[PDB]
Amino acid sequence: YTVHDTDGKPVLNNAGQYYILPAKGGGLGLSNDDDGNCPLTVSQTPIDIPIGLPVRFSSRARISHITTALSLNIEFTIAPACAPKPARWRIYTPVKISDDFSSAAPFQIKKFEEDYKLVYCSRKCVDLGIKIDNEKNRRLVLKEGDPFKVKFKKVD
């Protein structure tokens, strides 16, 4: 299926910027978890607001927007000045950001009831879920069967 944003418009492929928000904690961003100095681990912001770090979704296929059948890379388009460039997602085993060339595209978006979830694939895929259900350890990690239900709010 075609993946839509919260305004009903199709989510763009390798273009635009979206917060990944809970379908109802705030939107995904980064937090520091055995990463040294910089927040390098994908986390849901603790505070209950529809905001996060903006994300861009990317398939090498030259369709204008994102479908549930596409293989994706995902990167934060904006991040702390210390973070790597690009701030590309890669892998409880958590999701962190990195530079390394790795030409994989292991993420997809899938329908999840009325909204979506994110999966990680090797096409055998596993659900990406919320590690701990608290303030500061709500890290995005691999978690079969407990997917984090998300929607996509386009940034202006």
């Binding site: 090498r60 030259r62 369709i63 204008s64 030409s103």
Partner: protein, 223 residues
């Protein structure tokens, strides 16, 4: 299309826009009832728009016809994008005229260096995003099998060719998928994929149409 030019109106009369509420992919008219596109452009609901030049303005040469049959190649693989080809049968035949016309299937594979025309309403920028109202055109050479496979180690099957510039600049891009590469009055390519658009050593990769002539002719005849 990055590094291209705005095509003269209806000068690519075989180009279609695949529309599911907005433009998302291109296609090529190969006879009055059938369009060829990319298989990753597959949806259960597609409207085909022929005769278009400005896709956001009704100018008077448009024909809007719903897709009836929507058939991906049986061996399409969505992860590798091998056999990335699809046929659409229109629910009524297009009216053929100077602005809506057919493009011939290939009578053989194109040599390295053959010049092609590539067109679409995809992104016109290599950094950031810009989606044009007007159809964009690009003239580009078919690249050697050697250059192609060098640019994308492990990812080029015998059903893929590269077209464009190792130096980047000029390339197709997101929103151009499924569209035509036409070289000497033949369809030799379908927009398929790349790393980014218009980056150095990352040329456009295109479905090698000459491999599928028989698949196409047979699918038409059986439907």
């Amino acid at each position: 299309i990055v590094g291209g030019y705005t095509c003269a109106a209806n000068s690519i009369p075989y180009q279609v826009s695949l529309n599911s509420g907005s433009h998302f992919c291109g296609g090529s008219l190969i006879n009055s009832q059938w369009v060829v596109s990319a298989a990753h452009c597959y949806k259960s609901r597609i409207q085909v728009r022929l005769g278009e030049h400005n896709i956001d303005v009704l100018e008077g040469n448009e024909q809007f016809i719903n897709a009836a049959k929507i058939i991906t190649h049986p061996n399409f693989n969505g992860n590798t994008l091998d056999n990335d080809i699809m046929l659409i049968k229109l629910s009524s035949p297009a009216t053929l005229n100077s602005r809506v016309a057919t493009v011939s299937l290939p009578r053989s594979c194109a040599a390295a260096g053959t010049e092609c025309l590539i067109s679409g309403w995809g992104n016109t920028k290599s950094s950031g995003s810009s989606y044009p109202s007007l159809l964009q055109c690009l003239k580009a050479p078919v690249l050697s099998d050697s250059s192609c496979k060098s640019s994308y180690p492990g990812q080029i099957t015998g059903n893929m060719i590269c077209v464009g510039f190792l130096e980047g600049g000029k390339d197709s891009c997101q929103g151009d998928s499924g569209g035509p590469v036409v070289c000497n009055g033949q369809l030799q390519g379908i927009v398929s994929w790349g790393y980014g658009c218009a980056q150095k050593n990352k040329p456009g990769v295109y479905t090698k149409v000459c491999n599928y002539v028989n698949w196409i002719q047979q699918t038409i005849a059986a439907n």
